[PDB]
Write a protein that binds this ligand. Sequence first.
Ligand SMILES: *CC[C@H](CCC(=O)O)NCc1c(COP(=O)(O)O)cnc(C)c1O
Ligand SMILES: *CC[C@H](CCC(=O)O)NCc1c(COP(=O)(O)O)cnc(C)c1O
Ligand code: FES
Lengths: 461, 461
Amino acid sequence: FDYDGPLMKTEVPGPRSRELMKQLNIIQNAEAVHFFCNYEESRGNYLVDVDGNRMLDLYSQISSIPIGYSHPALVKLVQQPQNVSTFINRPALGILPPENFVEKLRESLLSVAPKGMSQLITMACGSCSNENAFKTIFMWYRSKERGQSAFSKEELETCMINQAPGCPDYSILSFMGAFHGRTMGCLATTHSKAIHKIDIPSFDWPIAPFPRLKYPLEEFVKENQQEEARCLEEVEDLIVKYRKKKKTVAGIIVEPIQSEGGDNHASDDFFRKLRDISRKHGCAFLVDEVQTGGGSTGKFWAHEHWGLDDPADVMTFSKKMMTGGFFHKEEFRPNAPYRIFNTWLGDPSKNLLLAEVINIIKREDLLSNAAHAGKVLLTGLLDLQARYPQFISRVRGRGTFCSFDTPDESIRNKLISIARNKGVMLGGCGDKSIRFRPTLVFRDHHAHLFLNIFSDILADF
Amino acid sequence: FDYDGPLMKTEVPGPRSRELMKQLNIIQNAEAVHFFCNYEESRGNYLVDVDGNRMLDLYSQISSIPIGYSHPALVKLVQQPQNVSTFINRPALGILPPENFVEKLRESLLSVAPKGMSQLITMACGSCSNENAFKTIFMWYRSKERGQSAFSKEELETCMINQAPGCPDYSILSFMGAFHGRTMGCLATTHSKAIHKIDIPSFDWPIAPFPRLKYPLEEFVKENQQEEARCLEEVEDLIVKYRKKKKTVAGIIVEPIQSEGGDNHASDDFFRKLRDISRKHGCAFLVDEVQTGGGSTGKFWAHEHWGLDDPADVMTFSKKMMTGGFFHKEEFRPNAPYRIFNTWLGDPSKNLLLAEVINIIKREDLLSNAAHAGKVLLTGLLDLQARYPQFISRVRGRGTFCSFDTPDESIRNKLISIARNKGVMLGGCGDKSIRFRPTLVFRDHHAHLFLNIFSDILADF
Ligand SMILES: *CC[C@H](CCC(=O)O)NCc1c(COP(=O)(O)O)cnc(C)c1O
Ligand SMILES: *CC[C@H](CCC(=O)O)NCc1c(COP(=O)(O)O)cnc(C)c1O
Ligand code: FES
């Protein structure tokens, strides 16, 4: 189920959107709002707004809508009378799970478990996924140190009043350009944009450089090899340095592709070596697939491209997955209950939808489709780069997870704004990059639709 | 719609529950699981399990089910064809809200706004509500320090690498016995149980004593006055002490009644004075109504009992309210977008349900019913206390938000376990307290039902 193409009636945001934006602005800061949407009339790759505009959506609610708007298979789930309870009786999952909790996990998340990770805990978003992944890692690392010994009296007393040794001074190593959420734990590992970080208390945790590749890749083989090697060495130096400061690095967190910080890529070789460094120093390797997970790179999890039997110790997810959570190795299993815990731990209604999402992905061969449609997209971007080097540079991607840079922030926003008025929703990341996050029902013909619109925009820009 | 009473077939957990518990334990630590539930057959005050047991539920998924299981008005919402899109098309609310977003907020959360708070931001749970309330407070504090001037270059650079002055060393003051969530920010303000806190890095923030009242209240007027006065003085000393340490207290967080820490109450006078101390020192007063909010104390928000025109600067909520979020004063409104932000910011499907919940609460006069049924409950508990002083002490409550202590942790768990096998789900809090969190369709005839069952339990104990 999909429309034949975009259809614009007004500038965006249009009159009805601007009116709803003014109403909402009374109650909260609404400057981020792009426009107001008619989700009821939205279908497949097309988002319809309240002014009747119908746009090809290559941003997908910031990479969170897996198989398009109003998918008929999802419609049918909500229509089934047996599913009513799931939507209106939300359980405290940690204590009172529903009968079908394990089976529905088998139909959904367990059927796509990463290699070597038998454990799974669910969470409602990417932030509590990473926060609880951090805690799982701290618990594991302390467990290694104390061995078979019990918690000590001193630890039980001091931990209640936020003091060592009960509350250790351990760290998670993160990368410049990273984004892992905005709760105060996650935020410490985030290094995306100053407006995200400023005025908020943080943690003194080590921050390593993420490789900046030069393009085109075939003209910078040696330079990119040396850049990645410099970054890996600086990661290792930081682990050593923080051990000496007695702020031991318990874990390393990284995105397979840095999203909010500007679609920064690195070679599979780089991630394989980073994983080895993690193991070498006893650091848990935490891979954040909140935005890369769900198939858009051509594999269900982006880390699968690395080709490792032991890719990671913990892996977080959300967005496309409908629910959050994290897979992990058996050895990271909490020793006691009520340590990794909260009221809802996700939502069974989201698991119900996800099981069907995953079924659609497999039956409609959507992983391979993302590789194919992404290849068409990227080929077209490379052509546009060759024809408009004054506006387009550093064209890059994997699957439909693509992007390019513009000369400055102002042109970037202008091109997004023109594209939108011409029927194509694009996203921005970093200071001057445009990014693509198409849903999994985006095909080679949607890529051409976009490419023809953007070609005309560029010609008289 | 409700059953006539409990009906037990087996001990709890029964065979089918124990089997499902074994399956779940492969994938995660499942020791917290009480039993598995048949939500499809649950109605009103009665939770039905997978072994056919039907129990009067006075715990309500840890105080998160507002108007009982399978409420007919909520069933009808899910059955409406126009509501399908809301459940299957989840928006990135911060950028692309649905057409009805503001109106549905008017039907729900804005209709129950606390006094003096015109602003509202939504969140998906209690933990991100408090985390973002903390950040809202830190931003407000720095903003009042810097005035109507720009971010400095030094601040913009240092904040990206987790350093002052971009990342200030400010604090939130919290109370012993408190519980505000388990993400690393929230967890710093939590002082409930050592298993919650141990092995997790924390923040050096001030921790004040919460008053431990003596019962019965009319025999300890002077002693409880002096206990509360001592606590208020210690709060103020801590604010002064942390100002000198250059870890300025930007805000104070408190529950109107401490839940997870053991149902600790204080007088309305105490909270009024705490609010005054907050204002006096320029600290934002953050009231956490995640568990007290939604009517069970006899007012929609528990802080309403205080009778203040200016009760707080910020107020968080979740659980009963379906979605999370927080209300706040206009002056706490963020100056720029993308500071308080995340992908989903709650869920429109939860707002849809909440609008109906609130309509039911008002039309069925459920606030007044909680006061009355709670009075019947508490009167019965006082009678049982008089008859069984060897097992029951410190009977206390407001509305149906009631509790009592037992002599030790072991008897507490034993009485919960006996009660459950006799058809009544009770909750525990603190080390040795039993607590009540009945849904809002708990009537007095349910109170008598409980009191008659438990009275027989105590005679046989
Ligand atoms: C996909 C967009 C979102 C960024 C929005 C923003 O806050 O600026 N990405 C989130 C993200 C998280 C946190 O997930 P959530 O709390 O927003 O649900 C964690 N890890 C990654 C890699 C991303 O992108
Ligand atoms: C209602 C019980 C729940 C405790 C669950 C747990 O984590 O042990 N209360 C949580 C709570 C929060 C955090 O809510 P959430 O993250 O579980 O949604 C915040 N503030 C209060 C007062 C409570 O009790
Ligand atoms: S922190 Fe993840 S839903 Fe609130």
